[PDB]
């Protein structure tokens, strides 16, 4: 099928970049979207590949960024987290 | 102030479930599968307003459907006491639904 | 069916804000998106509340997100112009 | 520097015309109808791997999901007068899905 997320919002904190011994950077952020009384929505966005390098270097707290990715719910130690995964199939644009 | 948009095409995982609020407004919950090659991602999709009556009347298990909505993450304490979060795709007047095939 | 366009780019000139016989507000812009150098120019038309805002807050050079629908309009002077219509079914957001 | 995205769900208006460049790579053209009443007709062109698939599995009146980007091409008609044609390009950066 089709699994597509498009966000424009504000980065809630400094990007967390870690490296995989196969070299590849991964970059996690929080991104805030709000609709207007006003209510904010927080999104867990995970960058992979070169976009992770670009993200983990250009983005800061309060950055306005455009993001295009896929929804992925992952199980971990049970807790579930639905992250927006942004890889070569996705896109990002600094605003 | 920003943009919060989800577009899914996939297959309904079970018959829908429609609830009528005391006011008369319908709320229709479904699960929605999307596949990449094979990983299947299961999505929680909730319809409000006019689209909830149409989703409930027309979506059935195995229906192929297009969905446009927004991401909403609901927080709740589990019976163990611990925080939990449930991210849903909300389809309301600002979203869209089309029955496919 | 489904007819959806999402754009992020820069406003080409300044918004041209006219009104209709309704008194409805309409706001035309051109909007440039770049690909990897090559620049695509989009003709974008706002209606209703979003047209008033586009004229109020867009200037030449300002960075915008727009969401709308493709409309191929006909005119004779026999032609065709494809437009991204951004009305109550769409969205716009001032970036930068 | 920007974002240029079109998403459509509709019905192919004709039988896909498939063509082949001197590089052999596939180029297939269709129309696609979207409608609410009002019917909007779209010029969609496929390239690369997705051009090959649009040829075999799309027919007159078939429903399809397409994801691509807008491209307007300029051409002088047989008047010398400028004309424009806006298409939806669906290449390796786009997406397509047969429905049903
Ligand atoms: O009434 C509507 C409306 O307000 C909006 C909307 C959603 C998000 C925005 O950011 C915005 O500016 C407008 O979408 C719609 C989409 C529909 O299919 C039908 C509608 O009636 C609305």
Author numbering:
A (entry chain B): 4 to 39, 49 to 89, 95 to 112
B (entry chain A): 3 to 39, 50 to 113
C (entry chain C): 4 to 39, 50 to 90, 95 to 113
D (entry chain D): 3 to 38, 50 to 113
How does the study describe this entry?
Single-stranded DNA (ssDNA)-binding protein (SSB) plays a crucial role in DNA replication, repair, and recombination as well as replication fork restarts. SSB binds to ssDNA with a high affinity regardless of the sequence and prevents premature annealing, chemical attacks, and unwanted nuclease digestion. In this study, the effect of the flavonols myricetin, quercetin, kaempferol, and galangin on the inhibition of Pseudomonas aeruginosa SSB (PaSSB) was investigated.
The complexed crystal structure of PaSSB with quercetin was determined at a 2.3 Å resolution. Four monomers of PaSSB were found in the asymmetric unit. A quercetin molecule could be found in a cavity created at the interface of PaSSB monomers A and C. However, unlike the complexed structure of PaSSB with myricetin, which contained two myricetin molecules per tetramer, only one quercetin molecule was found in the structure of the PaSSB tetramer. Having a similar binding site to myricetin, but with a different binding pose, the quercetin molecule was sandwiched between PaSSB monomers A and C. The binding of quercetin did not influence the overall structure of PaSSB. Residues Ile105 (monomers A and C), Asn106 (monomer A), Gly107 (monomer A), and Asn108 (monomer C) within contact distance (<4 Å) were involved in quercetin binding. Gly107 and Asn108 formed hydrogen bonds with quercetin. Based on our crystal structure, we found that in the absence of one OH group, compared with myricetin, quercetin could not interact with Lys7 and Glu80. Thus, quercetin did not inhibit the ssDNA binding activity of PaSSB.
